[PDB]
Amino acid sequence: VRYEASLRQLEQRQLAKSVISRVQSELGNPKFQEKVLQQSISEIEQLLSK
Amino acid sequence: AKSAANKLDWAKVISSLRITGSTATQLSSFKKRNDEARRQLLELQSQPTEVDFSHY
Amino acid sequence: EVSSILEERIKGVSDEANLNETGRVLAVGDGIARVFGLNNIQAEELVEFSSGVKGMALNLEPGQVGIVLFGSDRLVKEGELVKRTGNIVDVPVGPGLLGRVVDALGNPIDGKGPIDAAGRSRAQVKAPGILPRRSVHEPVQTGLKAVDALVPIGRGQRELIIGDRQTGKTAVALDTILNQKRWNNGSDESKKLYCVYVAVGQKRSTVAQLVQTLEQHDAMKYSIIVAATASEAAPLQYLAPFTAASIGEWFRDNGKHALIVYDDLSKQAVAYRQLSLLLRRPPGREAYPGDVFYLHSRLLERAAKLSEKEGSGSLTALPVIETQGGDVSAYIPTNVISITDGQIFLEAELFYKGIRPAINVGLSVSRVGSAAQVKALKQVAGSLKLFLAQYREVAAFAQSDLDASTKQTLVRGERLTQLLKQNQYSPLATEEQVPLIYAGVNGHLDGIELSRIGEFESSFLSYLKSNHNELLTEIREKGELSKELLASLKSATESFVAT
Amino acid sequence: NVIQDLYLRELKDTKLAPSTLQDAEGNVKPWNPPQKPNLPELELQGPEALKAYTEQNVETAH
Numbered sequence: 001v002r003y004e005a006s007l008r009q010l011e012q013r014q015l016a017k018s019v020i021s022r023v024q025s026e027l028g029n030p031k032f033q034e035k036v037l038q039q040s041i042s043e044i045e046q047l048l049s050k
Numbered sequence: 051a052k053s054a055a056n057k058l059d060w061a062k063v064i065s066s067l068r069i070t071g072s073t074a075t076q077l078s079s080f081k082k083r084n085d086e087a088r089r090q091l092l093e094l095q096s097q098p099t100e101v102d103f104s105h106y
Numbered sequence: 107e108v109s110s111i112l113e114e115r116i117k118g119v120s121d122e123a124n125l126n127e128t129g130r131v132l133a134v135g136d137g138i139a140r141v142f143g144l145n146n147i148q149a150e151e152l153v154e155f156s157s158g159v160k161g162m163a164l165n166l167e168p169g170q171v172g173i174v175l176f177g178s179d180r181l182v183k184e185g186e187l188v189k190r191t192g193n194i195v196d197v198p199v200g201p202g203l204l205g206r207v208v209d210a211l212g213n214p215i216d217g218k219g220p221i222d223a224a225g226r227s228r229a230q231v232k233a234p235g236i237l238p239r240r241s242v243h244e245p246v247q248t249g250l251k252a253v254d255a256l257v258p259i260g261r262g263q264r265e266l267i268i269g270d271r272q273t274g275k276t277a278v279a280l281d282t283i284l285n286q287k288r289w290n291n292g293s294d295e296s297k298k299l300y301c302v303y304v305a306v307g308q309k310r311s312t313v314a315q316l317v318q319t320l321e322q323h324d325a326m327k328y329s330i331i332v333a334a335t336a337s338e339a340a341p342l343q344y345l346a347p348f349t350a351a352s353i354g355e356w357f358r359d360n361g362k363h364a365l366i367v368y369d370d371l372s373k374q375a376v377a378y379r380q381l382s383l384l385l386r387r388p389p390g391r392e393a394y395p396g397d398v399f400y401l402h403s404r405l406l407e408r409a410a411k412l413s414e415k416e417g418s419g420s421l422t423a424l425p426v427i428e429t430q431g432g433d434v435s436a437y438i439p440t441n442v443i444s445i446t447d448g449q450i451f452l453e454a455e456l457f458y459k460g461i462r463p464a465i466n467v468g469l470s471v472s473r474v475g476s477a478a479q480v481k482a483l484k485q486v487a488g489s490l491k492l493f494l495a496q497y498r499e500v501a502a503f504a505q506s507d508l509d510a511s512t513k514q515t516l517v518r519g520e521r522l523t524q525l526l527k528q529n530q531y532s533p534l535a536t537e538e539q540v541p542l543i544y545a546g547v548n549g550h551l552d553g554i555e556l557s558r559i560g561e562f563e564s565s566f567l568s569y570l571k572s573n574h575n576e577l578l579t580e581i582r583e584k585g586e587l588s589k590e591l592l593a594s595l596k597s598a599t600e601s602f603v604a605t
Numbered sequence: 606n607v608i609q610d611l612y613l614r615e616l617k618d619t620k621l622a623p624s625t626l627q628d629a630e631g632n633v634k635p636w637n638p639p640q641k642p643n644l645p646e647l648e649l650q651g652p653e654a655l656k657a658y659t660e661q662n663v664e665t666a667h
Contacts, residue, residue, distance in 0.1 A: 001106070003633045007624060011108045014622035022614040031610060038606045046123065069666035109620040116612050 052086065059083060129153070129171070129188030136384045137175045137339065141188050144171045150230070152191040157181040160211070161188075162195060162341055165385055172385060176341045195230065197349045198223030199356035204300060205326040207317060209333050210342045210349045216317070224356070229348040231355060233407045240413040245478045246299060246365060246422055249285025249533025250278075250463055252526045255487040255543060256494075257450055257470045260478030261363055262411025262420035268427040268439060269452030269464075275426055276316070277530050278452060278463050279303070279367050282424070283325055285533035286365065290328045299422065300357050300364040302330040304350040307343060307373030309336045319531070340384075343377035351408045354421045358412065361419035366409070369426035371402060375438045392437040399441050406445045448472035461523065462530055467494055482540050482587045489547045493518055521551045524559040537582040541570055544592075545599045553603065569602045 026032070059079055066076045129143030139161065144153065150162045159177035166172075175182055198212045202222025209215045212223075242260035253259060259282075269275055282301075289297040303320075305313055313333055320326050330353060334346035347368050357364040368374070375394055382388075382395035390396035409423035427442050432454070434443060443449060451469035476484060497519025503512050525546055528534065542563060545551050554562050570578060577594060581587065587595070 003629055007629065008108055011622045011624060012112070015108065015112065015619065018619050018622065019611075019615055022611070022618055026607075026610050026614055035606050035610065042606065050124065071664035072666055107621065109616070113612075113616055116608070116615060119608050121608075 052090075055086070056083065125187070125189045126192060127188075127190040129173075129186075129190075131155075131182065131184045131186045131188065132170060134175075134179065134182050134184055137179050138384055139173045139175055139182060139186075139188070140167075140170045141173050142170055144173075144188060144190055147171050147190065148192075148194050151194050154189045154191050155182050156186040156188070157183075160191070162345070164381065165387075174341050174381060174385065176339055178339070194228055195345060195349075196226040196228045197352055198225070199227045199353050200224035201356075203330050203353055204328055205330075207313075207331040207333055209338065210346050212349075215333055227352050227356065229345060229352045231352065233404075234410045234412060234416065238413050238416050239410050240418055242411045242474050242478050244296075244363070244411070244420065245480055246282075246363075247285060247289070247480070247536050247539075248282040249288075249535065250281055250528060251534060251539050251542065252463060252465055252467070252528075253282075253450065254536070254539060255479075255483060255490060256465070256467055257448065257472040258476050258479035258483075259422070259424075259472070260411070260474045261422045262409060263448070263474040263478075264406055264409050264423040264425060264446050265448035265450055265472055265474075266425055266427055266442065266446050267369075267450050267452065268429060268434070268443065269450075270432055270454040270457075271428050271430065273452050273454055273457050273464060274530070275428065275452065276312075276369060278450075278465070279369060279424065279426060280316075280319065281463075281530060281533055282365070282367075283320070283329065284323050284531065285535075286328065287323065287325060288533075288535060295362055298328070298362060300328045300330075300362065301325075302332060302350055302354055302364060302366040304332045304334075304347055304366065304368045306334050306346050306368065306370060307336050307376070308333070308369075323531075340377045340380040343373065344381055346377075347371065347374055347405050351405060355408070358410070358419045358421040361412070361417040363420045363422065365422040365424065367424045367426065368405065370428050371405070371425050371442060372428045372438060374405075375402070394437055398438070402438075402441055403445050406442070447474055461527055463528060468498060480536055480540075480585060482581060482585055483536060483543070485587050485592075486540055486544045486547055490522070490543060493522060493547075497522065518549055518552050520556060521554065521559060522546050524556055525551065525563065527560075535582075537578050538567055538570075540581050540587070541578075541595065541599075542566065544595050545603075548596055548599060550599050550603045566599075566602050569605070570598065573598060573601070 059082070063076045063079060066072055066079075127144050127146065129141035131139045132142050133140050139155075141153075144163070147153070147163050147166060149166055150164060153161045153163060153173055155161065155173075155175070155177075157177070159175050159182050161173035161175050163171050163173050173188065197210070198221045200221070200223030203212075206214055206218050206221060207216040208221065212221055214221065239262070242263050244261040246259045246261055247254050248259055257265070259265065267275060267278060280303075283303065286299050286301055289299065292298070303316070305316060308316075313331070313335060316331060320329050320331070332346060332350040332353065334342050338346075350366060350368070354364055354366040375398060378398055378401050379394050382397075383393075388396045390398065395401075406423070406425060409421050411422075412419045425442065425446060427439055429439055430436060433439065448471055449469070450472075451466050452464050453466035453469065454464070456466055457464035479487075493515075496515050500512050500515040500519065504516060508516070525542065545566065551559070551562070574594075577591065577598065580591060584591075
């Protein structure tokens with residue numbers, strides 16, 4: 001049981017560093033450009049609701 | 051009960067007081083008391099034979 | 107799966123709305139960010155930095171708002187957005203915090219999952235007044251014979267555990283928590299003190315010991331450990347008793363009983379000192395902040411035995427103060443001593459002389475005291491107070507040609523002192539306190555050899571349990587010793603002494 | 606938006622990180638059986654002891 005829990009923590013940390021790799025991939029994409037538009041229109045909706 | 055055995059034992063230690071040339075009979079009786087007290091604590095110490103498999 | 111839990115967590119993030127007031131740090135040094143912005147800030151409001159650090163706003167200055175970082179300075183940096191959480195310091199309070207080791211924020215530092223709580227209540231809530239209280243009339247037994255008889259402990263009342271450094275001060279306290287298990291097991295809400303131990307400035311190693319001992323004695327199921335460890339920063343350390351008090355207030359508000367043990371306000375003092383000195387607020391006596399009296403007084407007045415209009419409840423408290431060289435003279439001790447209502451003064455010499463608990467009877471006092479003593483226990487221990495008093499006076503006479511009267515005092519006194527030794531972390535039920543003290547009072551223990559006192563004690567108890575646990579059950583349930591019981595008890599002691 | 610991007614990227618590109626049960630075995634204590642059922646030795650078997658005892662202690666009770 002002890003090693004099973006330890007292994008779960010280790011898996012989570014393996015996937016944590018894999019998440020950093022995915023973040024770098026996302027910031028590579030021109031999704032980086034396209035999501036600025038997504039933020040823009042979403043903010044237009046938000047700010048108009050004010 | 052166990053108390054019958056032990057009451058007769060300690061009464062007999064004090065009867066063995068009233069007889070000499072029996073200076074190690076009571077020491078054997080003391081040993082019997084010891085191990086009797088040991089088996090109950092042995093039994094109370096117990097880990098049940100089965101593994102836990104409901105929860106564990 | 108590890109994937110599924112992570113997937114739930116990512117899924118649980120989604121969108122936001124207008125950040126009401128941004129700030130930009132002007133300068134951050136010493137954990138004192140001085141922020142430009144936050145125009146409409148509420149006093150001591152919780153504010154969230156870019157780094158995610160949380161802060162309070164102790165100084166609201168005429169153009170800068172001096173946030174105090176709850177986090178480490180490393181994470182915060184100049185010009186940071188300082189979002190306004192917009193909620194003054196409040197902590198979840200409810201019933202679920204029982205058996206949850208939580209830090210000041212309420213985040214389980216033992217990972218016992220999201221807190222179940224019935225409210226989040228401010229930690230600056232002001233104590234109940236004059237008329238919202240009704241005088242103490244309910245004992246709290248600590249399972250320490252000396253504490254229960256020599257300095258009886260009530261409810262809603264406060265008494266110090268003021269004593270020399272690392273004399274296992276926490277041990278004296280922890281014993282009380284253990285004894286609460288017996289009453290806790292019962293179903294009556296009258297018989298339920300939900301203890302809260304407030305570990306202030308205590309090293310994580312210490313808290314590990316605390317956690318294990320409490321778990322070992324199954325205490326967690328009426329315990330809460332509010333933990334502000336040594337590492338945890340000075341805002342947390344400052345707000346740690348305040349936070350803890352709020353948790354207690356919820357129980358108190360429900361009209362239940364509970365015991366909150368602030369250990370130690372000496373480290374609370376240090377934290378306020380750190381905050382004030384770093385915020386450049388006027389310094390004061392013994393380099394403790396000018397308003398340190400005000401801080402301690404605010405905390406210690408929260409503890410209250412409520413009125414019947416407020417459906418009598420309590421929040422018994424036991425502050426712990428660590429004396430530096432035994433100096434009651436020292437500014438932080440003097441203040442607390444004045445504020446509290448009774449003191450228990452543990453003494454290092456006694457500890458060394460093997461008396462454990464090492465409570466020094468002379469320097470222990472209760473100003474509520476015998477008002478909330480068990481009636482049975484009161485009966486059988488008026489004598490005890492006087493005998494020990496005499497034993498103290500006749501103590502120095504222990505150097506030859508000694509009066510018969512003095513020698514009588516000495517025999518009785520030495521045996522009593524030996525009797526009041528107890529193996530720490532074993533509490534003793536009141537129904538077993540009452541017999542032992544009765545014997546001593548009737549001086550039948552005077553005859554018993556000093557070396558044999560320890561053996562005598564356990565034997566007397568087992569003998570009583572064999573001989574007549576009916577008497578014991580009567581003592582427990584009637585709680586008032588009838589002449590017939592006092593008769594029988596004397597007989598029983600005589601009979602036991604004979605064997 | 607970014608939430609969706611991360612959610613997608615993360616989940617898809619590696620759900621779990623590798624794990625092996627065999628490797629675990631080395632790092633955990635293995636079951637090992639108690640040795641011997643044991644039988645207690647026949648204590649003071651027969652009158653060899655008794656004949657000895659009667660003679661040895663013919664001691665009276667005064």
